[PDB]
Scaffold this active site. Structure first.
Site, PDB file in Angstrom:
ATOM      1  CD  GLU A 147      -2.727   1.329   2.350  1.00  0.00           C
ATOM      2  OE1 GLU A 147      -2.243   1.184   3.492  1.00  0.00           O
ATOM      3  OE2 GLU A 147      -3.936   1.513   2.119  1.00  0.00           O
ATOM      4  N   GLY A 281       2.604   1.458  10.981  1.00  0.00           N
ATOM      5  CA  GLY A 281       2.427   0.821  12.270  1.00  0.00           C
ATOM      6  C   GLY A 281       1.878  -0.580  12.115  1.00  0.00           C
ATOM      7  CG  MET A 283      -0.218  -3.034   4.689  1.00  0.00           C
ATOM      8  SD  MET A 283      -1.550  -1.866   4.590  1.00  0.00           S
ATOM      9  CE  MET A 283      -2.595  -2.502   3.308  1.00  0.00           C
ATOM     10  CG  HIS A 317      -6.469   1.220  12.601  1.00  0.00           C
ATOM     11  ND1 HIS A 317      -7.239   2.349  12.544  1.00  0.00           N
ATOM     12  CD2 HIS A 317      -5.797   1.171  11.433  1.00  0.00           C
ATOM     13  CE1 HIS A 317      -7.041   2.968  11.401  1.00  0.00           C
ATOM     14  NE2 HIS A 317      -6.179   2.265  10.702  1.00  0.00           N
ATOM     15  CD  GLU A 318      -3.753  -2.417  10.777  1.00  0.00           C
ATOM     16  OE1 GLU A 318      -3.694  -2.860   9.620  1.00  0.00           O
ATOM     17  OE2 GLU A 318      -3.687  -1.196  11.013  1.00  0.00           O
ATOM     18  CD  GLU A 340      -6.264   3.931   7.002  1.00  0.00           C
ATOM     19  OE1 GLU A 340      -6.603   3.810   8.182  1.00  0.00           O
ATOM     20  OE2 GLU A 340      -5.561   3.105   6.443  1.00  0.00           O
TER      21      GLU A 340
HETATM   22  C1  LIG Z   1       4.428   4.469  12.154  1.00  0.00           C
HETATM   23  O1  LIG Z   1       3.142   4.882  11.596  1.00  0.00           O
HETATM   24  C2  LIG Z   1       2.123   5.214  12.537  1.00  0.00           C
HETATM   25  O2  LIG Z   1       2.224   5.040  13.760  1.00  0.00           O
HETATM   26  C3  LIG Z   1       0.848   5.578  11.867  1.00  0.00           C
HETATM   27  C4  LIG Z   1       1.270   6.300  10.565  1.00  0.00           C
HETATM   28  C5  LIG Z   1       0.251   7.437  10.341  1.00  0.00           C
HETATM   29  C6  LIG Z   1       0.392   8.589  11.131  1.00  0.00           C
HETATM   30  C7  LIG Z   1      -0.509   9.628  11.053  1.00  0.00           C
HETATM   31  C8  LIG Z   1      -1.551   9.474  10.148  1.00  0.00           C
HETATM   32  O3  LIG Z   1      -2.463  10.522  10.043  1.00  0.00           O
HETATM   33  C9  LIG Z   1      -1.724   8.353   9.334  1.00  0.00           C
HETATM   34  C10 LIG Z   1      -0.807   7.306   9.427  1.00  0.00           C
HETATM   35  N1  LIG Z   1      -0.127   6.371  12.666  1.00  0.00           N
HETATM   36  C11 LIG Z   1      -1.502   6.016  13.029  1.00  0.00           C
HETATM   37  O4  LIG Z   1      -2.270   6.757  13.733  1.00  0.00           O
HETATM   38  C12 LIG Z   1      -1.785   4.537  12.654  1.00  0.00           C
HETATM   39  C13 LIG Z   1      -1.982   3.645  13.709  1.00  0.00           C
HETATM   40  C14 LIG Z   1      -2.190   2.293  13.343  1.00  0.00           C
HETATM   41  C15 LIG Z   1      -2.198   1.836  12.004  1.00  0.00           C
HETATM   42  N2  LIG Z   1      -2.414   0.490  11.697  1.00  0.00           N
HETATM   43  C16 LIG Z   1      -2.012   2.753  10.972  1.00  0.00           C
HETATM   44  N3  LIG Z   1      -1.953   2.340   9.596  1.00  0.00           N
HETATM   45  C17 LIG Z   1      -2.910   1.621   8.739  1.00  0.00           C
HETATM   46  O5  LIG Z   1      -3.990   1.208   9.154  1.00  0.00           O
HETATM   47  C18 LIG Z   1      -2.469   1.369   7.303  1.00  0.00           C
HETATM   48  N4  LIG Z   1      -3.489   1.729   6.393  1.00  0.00           N
HETATM   49  C19 LIG Z   1      -1.117   2.067   7.148  1.00  0.00           C
HETATM   50  C20 LIG Z   1      -0.489   2.338   5.731  1.00  0.00           C
HETATM   51  C21 LIG Z   1       0.620   1.303   5.415  1.00  0.00           C
HETATM   52  N5  LIG Z   1       1.790   1.921   4.837  1.00  0.00           N
HETATM   53  C22 LIG Z   1       2.493   1.290   3.694  1.00  0.00           C
HETATM   54  N6  LIG Z   1       2.056   0.147   3.166  1.00  0.00           N
HETATM   55  N7  LIG Z   1       3.580   1.907   3.203  1.00  0.00           N
HETATM   56  C23 LIG Z   1      -1.805   4.111  11.303  1.00  0.00           C
HETATM   57 ZN   LIG Z   2      -5.641   2.266   8.765  1.00  0.00          ZN
END
Ligand SMILES: COC(=O)[C@H](Cc1ccc(O)cc1)NC(=O)c1ccc(N)c(NC(=O)[C@@H](N)CCCNC(=N)N)c1
Ligand SMILES: [Zn+2]
Ligand SMILES: *[C@@H]1O[C@H](CO)[C@@H](O[C@@H]2O[C@H](CO)[C@@H](O)[C@H](O)[C@H]2NC(C)=O)[C@H](O)[C@H]1NC(C)=O
Ligand SMILES: *[C@@H]1O[C@H](CO)[C@@H](O[C@@H]2O[C@H](CO)[C@@H](O)[C@H](O)[C@H]2NC(C)=O)[C@H](O)[C@H]1NC(C)=O
Ligand SMILES: *[C@@H]1O[C@H](CO)[C@@H](O)[C@H](O)[C@H]1NC(C)=O
Ligand SMILES: *[C@@H]1O[C@H](CO)[C@@H](O)[C@H](O)[C@H]1NC(C)=O
Ligand SMILES: *[C@@H]1O[C@H](CO)[C@@H](O)[C@H](O)[C@H]1NC(C)=O
Ligand SMILES: *[C@@H]1O[C@H](CO)[C@@H](O)[C@H](O)[C@H]1NC(C)=O
Ligand SMILES: *[C@@H]1O[C@H](CO)[C@@H](O)[C@H](O)[C@H]1NC(C)=O
Ligand SMILES: *[C@@H]1O[C@H](CO)[C@@H](O)[C@H](O)[C@H]1NC(C)=O
EC number: 3.4.11.-
Length: 899
Positions: A147, A281, A283, A317-318, A340
């Site tokens: 993704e 965090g 996928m 979340h997942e 999301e």
């Molecule tokens: C270190 O990353 C974090 O901690 C994230 C990143 C993030 C920060 C601010 C934001 O506004 C959106 C995403 N922050 C969050 O709040 C979050 C907490 C749990 C999750 N499972 C997620 N992601 C998801 O559900 C997936 N859709 C992620 C995309 C996969 N990326 C890839 N394939 N390259 C995000």
């Molecule tokens: Zn998500």
């Protein structure tokens, strides 16, 4: 529109022709974890509609070595010929497959390619990861992360969310390895040389970014749900113990989501695997969900109450994605929030449902506050806006898509009520299962919620009218940037309401403010309660101004009950005074979320210059009686904020007074704290907060407590144990000696708790030595001792504090080139590295430097929205200081006197 050695590339759009349409992929992948690469091949049953000379799909960094068409309906391509000519336009990550004779409408064909590539070397596509065993061994696994647009780095395909398809996946391997994918394993077969080959149940219909496969040597723990779904938590062998909680919660949680959405999870199994190198965090790939060890693993001895809440959340979340995202999929990345924001929102519903003891309901306002920060700058964006380049698509992953989305859905639920909301949701999920939807479909479904349905009375016209309303509303929250300010003037029994676009670092008199007020208008489901009646009233303000007639007519009015609404309220006249008065005598006469929102809103208005700092600071007096921790901590977070802001310049007179007011006031509650893990989650949270505050304020008793624990720890060689809630305080305290810091770094290298590691590396970065800090960064870049997936947070930790903001900035600027070789432009890693090193700046000097660095960064070709955002933010900071710094000096100096 053309290259790769001559010849016209038939198609010229970034998007893909919708003529071709795939239906099924046979996918065979054969990776070698010694040579670290893969060979592989595929068979795509397409269905042509329009007739065509060419067929177009995505590929990137894959070497394509054979290509054939083949059909069962169109004889000219009966088994097995014929060969296709391969045209590769990289600049649009596309390839063209050249057919010998025009294809035929309504006939299914079969596209087949053999391709190969090296295993990736960072966070995307089909990449290499490593992990340390308790033995000290380093082992290798190979994992997918697609993704939003990296499926195409693994196997050529129709790599846009709308082309759903069935997938059939074979993986070849040695026997030190197992092989996971989306679906369960049907068949293993032995091969001549000795290798094994896994066959997986053809998937349901689904999108490419969700396709997954892993080749590792992990262990698991399994269990079954109500509906008989097999859940397994995979992790590297020596960490199996840490997979228990994840199993428990995932189970309860999948049970919950099945009930709530009234849809079973369709696959037979659900795996949750903790990947050692992992950028996001987690996928959410269907049936095979990947996590950072810190999002999944848990261990009672070293991870904390807060950690548990984090893990619960991410797991919540997942799984929500499996429905919101996987089952129903956004039509295109413009509406990523459909995925999301719902998933973020459903965090709150499910964790509250299944784990109310985590007290996560109180915490969720933070989600909403956090967005208001960025959503109150001009550089914000609407929740749902257009996107094309993969770099833009990567940019849609941000607080707007996530938090803001979740937040207005929480607004909307309060409007329609749970039971209605749940209904509307359940409908949306059903009507769109196994296909896609766009913004508007959600509204239609959520508005048209459920006699009436489904087989001509009065108040049945009100329903189809109220429905059209509910839709008309949300349209404005999704296409308009920013959040609205509601101004309330109390006049006897007449309350007047004004609607405004909340700005910040922009005042109502300032030259710019009035252009920025544009055509902004919202349908704001208002609510309120009065000092005379706790009964909640509701009214939809569909316009620039309006007026409500109050019964009883009483002391104060409180708009946004419990803050369920995405707006800030202001009180002209004596409202702010009435309310702070009420807050000071019987605060209990105000709802706790109303308190948490007043403290939020109050300080946010000093931001807009619609209130002066001394009102805000005069509200915080009641905190000494404040007993609900959500409110105590929000307040405390502001004063603490201030201090750190002062400390970051030399402003030592103000900082030292802040420090003194903080230890002097709050001394009672600071002093009741145990150095324990006992009590509630918010109990434990409050403890760490205060003890941390104290230890950061050099309150020498608590530095002594900590330095004791640390010592007892280091001499017992790990035997003597430090409660989790206090673990980071202690570690940071110990970390001030070159001895503690040395010990701590060494202990980091040997630890098997990804959470302890986290806490240690924070401790290491609260070192005053330039030399120390820099090493961390270096080690971070190198990526052997400290994984590079930790680099961004690390820099941010360092930059955050006086002895380090310089070093950080310096490093980032001087290393932009190298950093990019590690992360996409692109990535949340780069985004967080840029802003984590600059957005706390509050000087005209620093603003100067940052404007230059970004300027530079454009041509070479690099544009990111985060550039302007940062700029606006440092500006807000400068303007904040100059427009309230003296008031803070004074309010504090006044305070040292009386009394
Ligand atoms: C270190 O990353 C974090 O901690 C994230 C990143 C993030 C920060 C601010 C934001 O506004 C959106 C995403 N922050 C969050 O709040 C979050 C907490 C749990 C999750 N499972 C997620 N992601 C998801 O559900 C997936 N859709 C992620 C995309 C996969 N990326 C890839 N394939 N390259 C995000
Ligand atoms: Zn998500
Ligand atoms: C990956 O390639 C390695 C070669 O380095 C393969 O290992 C060899 O396998 C053959 C027969 O299976 C043995 O005779 C060799 O001695 C092996 N070499 C080593 C260094 O162990 C391995 O089988 C390949 N794996 C896959 C899945 O293709
Ligand atoms: C491709 O996926 C679909 C599911 O998305 C497969 O199953 C059909 O799905 C519907 C929807 O749930 C089921 O009610 C049907 O029972 C399924 N079909 C059959 C014949 O049972 C579909 O079979 C998949 N295609 C392949 C080739 O496996
Ligand atoms: C072929 O597709 C075009 C759009 O690309 C569509 O307008 C047309 O109806 C299709 N051809 C036929 C014969 O239907
Ligand atoms: C997990 O910890 C318990 C003690 O709490 C121990 O008995 C068990 O052997 C451990 N298992 C593994 C795999 O380390
Ligand atoms: C949390 O759950 C309780 C019951 O467990 C329920 O009454 C309440 O409405 C829920 N809160 C939210 C915000 O959903
Ligand atoms: C505010 O944003 C708009 C559009 O995003 C832009 O045209 C305008 O220049 C911005 N205002 C300032 C002061 O930068
Ligand atoms: C006001 O605060 C007092 C503090 O003792 C409390 O007993 C009382 O219940 C509060 N007022 C009302 C109306 O409950
Ligand atoms: C300001 O602080 C720096 C270190 O941050 C110190 O070297 C310098 O002497 C201070 N200047 C004044 C005027 O206090």
């Amino acid at each position: 529109p053309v290259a790769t050695n001559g010849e016209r590339f038939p198609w010229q759009e970034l998007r893909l022709p919708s003529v071709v349409i795939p239906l099924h992929y046979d996918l065979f992948v054969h990776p070698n974890l010694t040579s670290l690469d893969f060979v592989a091949s595929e068979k795509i049953e397409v269905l042509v509609s329009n007739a065509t000379q060419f067929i177009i799909l995505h590929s990137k960094d894959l070497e394509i070595t054979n290509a054939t068409l083949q059909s069962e309906e169109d004889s000219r391509y009966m088994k097995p010929g014929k060969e296709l000519k391969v045209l590769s336009y990289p600049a649009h990550e596309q390839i063209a497959l050249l057919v010998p004779e025009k294809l035929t409408p309504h006939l299914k064909y079969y596209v087949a390619m053999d391709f190969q590539a090296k295993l990736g070397d960072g966070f995307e596509g089909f990449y290499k990861s490593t992990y340390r065993t308790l033995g000290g061994e380093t082992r290798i696994l190979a994992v997918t992360d697609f993704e939003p647009t990296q499926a195409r780095m693994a196997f050529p395909c129709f790599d846009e969310p709308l082309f759903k398809a069935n997938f059939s996946i074979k993986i070849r391997r040695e026997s030190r390895h197992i092989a996971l994918s989306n679906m369960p394993k049907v068949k293993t077969i032995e091969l001549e040389g000795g290798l094994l080959e896994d066959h997986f149940e053809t998937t349901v219909k689904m999108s490419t970014y969700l396709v997954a496969y892993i080749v590792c040597d992990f262990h698991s723990l399994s269990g079954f749900t109500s509906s008989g779904v097999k859940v397994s938590i995979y992790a590297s062998p020596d960490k199996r113990n840490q997979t228990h909680y994840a199993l428990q919660a995932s189970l309860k949680l999948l049970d919950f989501y099945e009930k709530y959405f009234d849809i079973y999870y369709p696959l037979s199994k659900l795996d949750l695997i903790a990947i050692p190198d992992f950028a996001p965090g987690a996928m959410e790939n269907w049936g095979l969900i990947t996590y950072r060890e810190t999002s999944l693993l848990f261990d009672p001895k070293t991870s904390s109450a807060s950690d548990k809440l984090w893990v619960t959340r991410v797991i919540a979340h997942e799984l929500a994605h499996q429905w919101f995202g996987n089952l129903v999929t956004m039509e295109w990345w413009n509406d990523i929030w459909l995925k999301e924001g719902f998933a973020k929102y459903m965090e709150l519903i499910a964790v509250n449902a299944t784990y109310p003891e985590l007290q996560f309901d109180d915490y969720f306002l933070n989600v909403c506050f956090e967005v208001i920060t960025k959503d109150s700058l001009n550089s914000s964006r609407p929740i749902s806006k257009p996107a094309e380049t993969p770099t833009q698509i990567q940019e849609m992953f941000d607080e707007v898509s996530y938090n803001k989305g979740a937040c207005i859905l929480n607004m909307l639920k309060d409007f329609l009520g749970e039971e209605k909301f749940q209904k509307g949701i359940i409908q949306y999920l059903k009507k769109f299962s196994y296909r896609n939807a766009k913004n508007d479909d959600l509204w239609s479904s959520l508005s048209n919620s459920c006699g009436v349905c489904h087989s001509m009375t009065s108040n049945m016209l009100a329903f189809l009218g109220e429905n059209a309303e509910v839709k008309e509303m949300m349209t404005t929250w999704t296409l308009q940037k920013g959040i609205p300010l509601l101004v309330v003037k109390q006049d006897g029994c007449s309350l007047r309401l004004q609607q405004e676009r909340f700005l910040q670092g922009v005042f109502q008199e300032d030259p710019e403010w009035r252009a920025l007020q544009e055509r902004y208008l919202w349908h704001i489901p208002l609510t309120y309660s009065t000092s005379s009646s706790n009964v909640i009233h509701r009214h939809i303000l569909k316009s620039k101004t309006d007026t409500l007639d109050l019964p009883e007519k009483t002391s104060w009015v409180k708009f946004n009950v419990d803050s369920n609404g995405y707006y800030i309220v202001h009180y002209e006249g004596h409202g702010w005074d009435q309310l702070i008065t009420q807050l000071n005598q019987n605060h209990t006469l105000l709802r706790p979320k109303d308190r948490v929102g007043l403290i939020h809103d109050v300080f946010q208005l000093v931001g807009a210059g619609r209130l002066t700092l001394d009102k805000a600071l005069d509200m915080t007096y009641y905190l000494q009686h404040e007993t609900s921790s959500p409110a105590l901590l929000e307040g405390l977070s502001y004063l603490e904020s201030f201090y750190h802001m002062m400390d970051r310049r030399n402003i030592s007179d103000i900082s030292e007074n802040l420090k003194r007011y903080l230890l002097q006031y709050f001394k009672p509650v600071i002093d009741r704290q145990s150095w324990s893990d006992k009590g509630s989650v918010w109990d434990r949270m409050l403890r760490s907060a205060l003890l941390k505050l104290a230890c950061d304020l050099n309150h020498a008793p608590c530095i002594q407590k900590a330095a004791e624990l640390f010592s007892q720890w280091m001499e017992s060689s790990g035997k003597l144990n430090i409660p989790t809630d206090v673990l980071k305080i202690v570690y940071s305290v110990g970390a001030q000696t070159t001895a503690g810091w040395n010990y701590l770094l060494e202990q980091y290298e040997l630890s098997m708790s990804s959470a302890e590691q986290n806490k240690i590396l924070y401790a290491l970065s609260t070192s005053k030595h330039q030399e120390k800090l820099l090493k961390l960064i270096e080690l971070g870049m190198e990526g052997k001792v400290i994984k590079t997936q930790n680099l961004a947070a690390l820099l941010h930790a360092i930059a955050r504090r006086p002895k380090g903001q310089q070093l950080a900035w310096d490093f980032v600027r001087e290393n932009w080139t190298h950093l990019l070789k590690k992360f996409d432009l692109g990535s949340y890693d780069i985004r967080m590295i840029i802003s984590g090193t600059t957005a706390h700046f509050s000087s005209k000097d620093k603003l100067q430097e940052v404007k230059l660095f970004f300027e530079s960064l454009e041509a070479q070709g690099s544009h990111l929205d985060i550039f302007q955002t940062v700029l606006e933010t440092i500006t807000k900071n400068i303007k904040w200081l100059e427009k309230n710094l003296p008031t803070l000096r004074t309010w504090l100096m006044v305070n040292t006197r009386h009394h």
